[PDB]
Amino acid sequence: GTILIDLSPDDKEFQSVEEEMQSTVREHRDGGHAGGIFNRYNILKIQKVCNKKLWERYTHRRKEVSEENHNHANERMLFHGSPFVNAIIHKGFDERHAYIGGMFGAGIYFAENSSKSNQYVYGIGGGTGCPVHKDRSCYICHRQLLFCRVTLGKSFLQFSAMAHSPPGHHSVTGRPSVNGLALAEYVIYRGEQAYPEYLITYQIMRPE
Ligand SMILES: CC(C)(C)c1ccc(-c2nc3ccccc3c(=O)[nH]2)cc1
Ligand SMILES: [Zn+2]
């Protein structure tokens, strides 16, 4: 029941989604090892993900969290990178998309920095790079990210450098406390707390 609606670059919706990609790029402490070396992207396509059943699954859970948290879903738009982007848009988020070895435990992880999510496009640590060239820093191959609606509800705040939420909470916020440029990262423990709104196809660009 998933259809993908192709957006025009003339559409203000495309523009604001792209602006969110580009402006949340940062340098990484691995010097580009996982995600490649780039300051910006070449956005090839942005598609809206329409799945009624997955959307209704999302809103049902959203209303539940909201009601446990003074009518406040605490909803964000966050990036997600994964080799399983394609299963996610058709079948939705579930336990097979969880990062078992993550620093905040076995859950599904999201990023405010698009470039953080980019490090996961080819696997943990960027795996072995793109399938074609085995290059983690490939400038040729097409990459895909999700820009997702995420229900955080009451988030356990964790200062720093599948399972359950900490009791009394609906998610975990990893606050950065070493790198002053890093944006927050987030973990949900139920697939229903995220909807894969936008599929963005792109290339990282070789810096000049
Ligand atoms: C274990 C698999 C391969 C399913 C997987 C693990 C972690 C991510 C993933 N982690 C992240 C961790 C922090 C911030 C953003 C992300 C992100 O955007 N993605 C994606 C897939
Ligand atoms: Zn490649």
> Which neighbouring-strand residues pair with 144?
201
Best substitution site from 28, 78, 82, 100 to test ligand 1's pocket, by max atoms within 8 Å of Cβ? 82
Cβ partners under 8 Å of residue 93, min gap 6: 108, 191, 192, 194, 196
Expressed in Å, this structure's resolution amounts to 2.5
Query: DSSP string covering 91-151, please?
Result: H---GGG-BTT-TT-SBEEEESSHHHHHTTTTSGGGTTS-TTT--TT-SSS-EEEEEEEEE
Q: What is the DSSP letter of 11?
A: S
CA of 10 to the centre of ligand 1 (A): 31
What domains does the chain contain, in order, with CATH numbers? 1-208 (3.90.228.10)
* Structural contact between residues 81 and 159, judged by C-beta atoms closer than 8 angstroms: no
Query: Could you give the CA distance from residue 49 to residue 55 in angstroms, rounded to a whole number?
Result: 10
Binding-site residue ranges for Zn(2+)? 130, 133, 138, 141
Q: Taking the mean position of all CA atoms in its chain, how far away is CA 164?
A: 20
* CB of 119 shorter than 6 A to ligand 1: no
- Residue 49 corresponds to which tokens in the numbers above? 């993900």
Residue 55 φ then ψ, to 5°: -65, -45
Concatenated DSSP letters of 152-189: --SEEEEEE------TT-SEEEEEESS-TTPPPEEEES
Residue 127 tokens, joined = 């795996």
Confirm if 208 and 38 have CB atoms less than 8 A apart. Answer: no
Q: How far apart are CA 144 and CA 28, in angstroms?
A: 19
Give the 3-state secondary structure of residue 1: coil
Which residue CA neighbors atom 20 of ligand 1 most closely? 82
Q: Using CA atoms, how far apart are residues 37 and 34, in angstroms rounded to an integer? A: 9
Closest ligand 1 atom, residue 185 Cα: 14
Give the whole-angstrom CA distance, residue 57 versus residue 96.
17
Spatial separation of the C-alpha atoms in residues 62 and 68, rounded to whole Å = 10
Q: Cα 31 vs. chain centroid, distance in angstroms?
A: 21
Radius of gyration of the chain (CA): 16
Closest-CA residue to 155 (of 195, 188, 180, 194):
188
